[PDB]
């Protein structure tokens, strides 16, 4: 309702900041920008932007502070899925019923236009026109999302899966690989929108960690439910939709002391579920 | 060779710096690391690292101050090697006599492991513990590598390498791709370390730049001619040969009255058209 809202500003907000990213300063890379723009602005949901912006209102910062945060996080996002497409990885030919990157250029360009972004994803926050924050907290927002996209986060994560495949785990090592290979970009993502605020603070970023990383194992435990080695699979149909609940619990609980400006944090956790 | 004393110090520090990176945080996490490891501690040259230190001595800094600098060069730099040997690009199944990424492992660990290499460069110079500078200048790195790794430069060169075909190519094209391709990273290892210096300065920082951008197409230049669209075909041998010394010329004449510390460029400028 108020969410729905929400989401729509949100993803106005960071789709106008991404399509200024992707002018090639020279005719030679036109094709590699064209293909770096069709692979973020294909009308994705930007939840990871919306973590950001919903972070900074959670502190009292006006939203379009966490731009940058916004556009970093959702590049960092966008790269990975170009590459995970890839014959390689999940082989996909299609997402959301249009051509993946690799398929409508070639593989050798979704590969670059993919290194492209995960390059750019940092120098936006490195760019202190950009990304117009003191200059300590740049270099957290800089070190946080490294963490989190790099082998320890994310890319860490796809690589748990790959050693996974035809071994059944069970629900611990299932969330290992889950707060690895989302968790860590979710987590980050707010994390970000935080800093951007200009008035983090240890207690808030503690606060906004565990929102976080109950609402990123909530998003998944929500979509095998929808899709409906998954949650359902391991626990039941009715102990994982139990499940949910739980982890939406735990996110409202660590908004307790926050003031109205979280409200978004606390619609999007019971929408999830 | 005439770098060997310079060049073997380099690589001993950013060897020794480069292998505390590659420590799995946990178990599930190994074999990605171990293909981390495979696809850097592979006895490279380290040119990168070696143009961060001496860009670094050059303007009076001690070199252990461009230990962030030399990691992250070397890691964009190796990275982007990892994806150039995958079968949609080069498809090569060696690199100096041992197996790729991919065939050691396999292509989704390959494609898994660069990644983590690119995002480890930007986690190392954004790491005030790792990379000491001052904080803007911390900034400033971040920023030059971002720039020069990305789809403006060293990804954006491999895209115009991809794009430009035909036994036809004229020698400005040819200039445009490997400034981008090779060039910019080139140029970005020189400039973060004198960054790293603590005693950059506009003049001193644009000579740097001129001076990498010479040697940058000075290695090209000598490749090809060492190899035999070259600069032979384009230019002719003899005058592709004398091509050759006038990079290193330019790269020279950029370091006039940089004082007796700018030696190591100087031997490295050299050694670049003097190989074998």
New interface residues.
Partial sequence: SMIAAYQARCQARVDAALDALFVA?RE??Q???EA?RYSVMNGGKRVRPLLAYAACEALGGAPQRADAAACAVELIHA??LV?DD?P??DDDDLRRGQPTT?RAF????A???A??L???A??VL???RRNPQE??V??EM??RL??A?????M??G???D??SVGVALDQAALE??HRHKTGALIEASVRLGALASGRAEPASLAALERYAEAIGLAFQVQDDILDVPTYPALLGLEAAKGYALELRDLALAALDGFPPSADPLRQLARYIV
């Fill in positions: 300063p030679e890379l094709r590699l920008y770096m790269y990975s590459h890839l390689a990885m690799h070639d593989e050798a360009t590969i670059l236009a290194d492209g995960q390059a750019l940092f120098e490195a760019d202190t200059h300590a740049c270099l800089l070190t490294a963490r996209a790099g082998s320890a986060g890319v860490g796809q690589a748990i790959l050693g290992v690989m």
